[PDB]
């Protein structure tokens, strides 16, 4: 449970800051989905993030800026040729830990329109 | 692994900030724990701590003011009858969830 995991996690790093709130920004036409920004990310290793459209592997990334306030804006364009994605689709993204050859990643957002 | 449990807090609740790192407070003598400060506990529920003592459960209290940093200060003096913990003995303190009838808790402090 999230309870659990809060306090498991609270006991074993002390200390945590983060905001990944995901904010779905469109293109235009308004109806892709162009990008994911999370409000605060971590920060103290360069994570990489991979993206899944309709279980197809657009591979993974990681030359997306962060900013003073700790925001960091994730760019469809950069893995879907140059366009966003149909907001029909499923998009998951997920955090890809660094010094892990790609393979150690966690979920961190999807989007799946309803 | 800790890297493990922070993304999947973060797929579930999005966004969280705490400090739970424990500042264990003297008293005097100063071979006395008095007291464990955490820098910014979560205040989304009202979260009681159990307390023991080398193996000695001396119960749960709650009456330990939230300050607006976020900071809390468990007081051990409200669980020992008056008088802190020589710091030669074990301290464990639980952060107990309400409304699961005092059943639920995590070990968040331990002192040897
Ligand atoms: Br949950
Ligand atoms: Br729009
Ligand atoms: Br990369
Ligand atoms: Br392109
Ligand atoms: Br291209
Ligand atoms: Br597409
Ligand atoms: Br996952
Ligand atoms: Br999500
Ligand atoms: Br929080
Ligand atoms: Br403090
Ligand atoms: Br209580
Ligand atoms: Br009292
Ligand atoms: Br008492
Ligand atoms: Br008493
Ligand atoms: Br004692
Ligand atoms: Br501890």
């Not at 995991?5 to 790093?13: E, I, K, S």
């Not at 990681?62 to 149909?86: D, E």
């Amino acid at each position: 449970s999230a309870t659990s995991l809060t306090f498991q996690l609270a006991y074993l790093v002390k200390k945590i800051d983060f905001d990944y709130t995901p904010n779905w920004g469109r293109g235009t036409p308004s109806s892709y989905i162009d990008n994911l920004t999370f409000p605060k990310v971590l920060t103290d290793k360069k994570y990489s993030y991979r993206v899944v459209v309709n279980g197809s592997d657009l591979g993974v990334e990681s030359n997306f800026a962060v900013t003073p306030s700790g925001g960091q804006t994730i760019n469809f364009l950069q893995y879907n040729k140059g366009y966003g994605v149909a907001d029909t689709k499923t998009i998951q993204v997920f955090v890809v830990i660094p010094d892990t050859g790609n393979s150690e990643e966690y979920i961190i957002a999807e989007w799946k329109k309803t």
